[PDB]
Design a protein around this ligand. Structure first.
Ligand code: ZN
Ligand code: ZN
Lengths: 237, 237
């Protein structure tokens, strides 16, 4: 395994690649479906048949379809993010996962193939109350046990991203099994603020199903993996 | 003595503490001074005046300054470690000793008091040759007799630690006289490989000084002690 995520994003190792095309993000909100507890974190699932919903530009050769998005977090506000910036970790991290619709026939096989997925990573930090996030925070009480679902209405994932879209990018892997190295990571440089009360609600979920011992959902992040010999390109000077 | 070490680390006694902060380890390789034969095992000494080389995070209330680190081995590659994991004992064990510079003015005092020390125990196992260890091995013929010392060039202890830093922690005592209960133990779940040649070299050391009869240095480990009612908490689940 020589391309594992996450990594400590260090400025001293990043190189500005001016030839990076702008990143075009446009998601079809009406394709949102359900929110569910996976046993690890909670995901928000979308209908990826709508080729219109997805991502392109940046370091991608073509358009990648939005499949789902999840978050990672810790037992306290001091830690929880998977990536670190200069060795600094944030209380949480959102992951928008998109798949290669031209190279792969479906998401299952994109997930494990070379250049099969493209994931945007957004750090979350404490600050102001975040309006759009609240739509999700609001249904968490119905998805406390593993494998449990809730229906979701229209939700636009772009509303979770920051205004400043500067990012770093590098070839990596999934941070969950099987840890396939099928991912083009697009880590946004600027974090979005959420309130502690919103973030607190996240630690209310459980790793356990119903009937089992109460096993709280916290510290669902993978430890830092070394860059090895990877080119960590920045889209900003 | 209620909190004596070493102990047998059994998973049935383990309780995951998700409140443990990430364990930061950063050593100033440059503070390495000499390597000497103590009469019991061999020990690499550091210059502890550097308020930077040491550890923090995990179960510590603060920064603990690196002092030294030694090894424990047996007469054969079948036993040698002090601690055991579910009854399994490894060929050898490394201990990285740090003292509480916040509470104690110096190491001699820290080693016999309150929360004076924090030690990282790493298990060595037969396997791949270890590059970082070789530097150590390369100087052993110089310290074959007790109280012998050889100056050391810049050396980094982390090169002896495992990539994965999951650990067990519990309060304990020194495993050499005075056997003081001043040690917060941090034992790394993941063993580090070394070849038989490197481990074979450990066995050419002597308990005896120069002029004396040759009393080989082997089996310099304390026997297992009862856990009693202590909390053996793990950083992993
Ligand atoms: Zn993720
Ligand atoms: Zn020791």
């Amino acid at each position: 395994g020589t391309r594992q995520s996450p990594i400590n994003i260090q400025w001293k190792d990043s190189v500005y690649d001016p030839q990076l095309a702008p990143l075009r993000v446009s998601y079809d909100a009406a394709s949102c479906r359900y929110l569910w507890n996976t046993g690890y974190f909670f995901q928000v699932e979308f209908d990826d048949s709508c080729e219109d919903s997805g991502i392109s530009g940046g370091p991608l050769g073509n358009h990648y379809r939005l499949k789902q998005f999840h978050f990672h977090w810790g037992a306290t506000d001091e830690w929880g993010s998977e990536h670190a910036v200069d060795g600094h970790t944030y209380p949480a991290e959102l992951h928008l996962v998109h798949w290669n619709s031209t190279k792969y026939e479906n998401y299952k096989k994109a997930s494990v193939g070379e250049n099969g997925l493209a994931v945007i990573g957004v750090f979350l930090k404490l600050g102001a109350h975040h309006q759009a996030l609240q739509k999700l925070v609001d249904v968490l009480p119905e998805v406390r046990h593993k494998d449990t679902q809730v229906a979701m209405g229209p939700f636009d994932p772009s509303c979770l991203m920051p205004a400043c879209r500067d990012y770093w990018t590098y070839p990596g892997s999934l941070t969950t099994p099987p840890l396939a190295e099928s991912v083009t990571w697009i880590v946004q440089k600027t974090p979005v603020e959420v309130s502690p009360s919103q973030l607190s609600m996240f630690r209310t979920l459980l790793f356990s199903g119903r009937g089992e011992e109460e096993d709280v959902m916290v510290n669902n992040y993978r430890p830092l993996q070394p860059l090895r010999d990877r080119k960590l390109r920045s889209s900003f000077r």
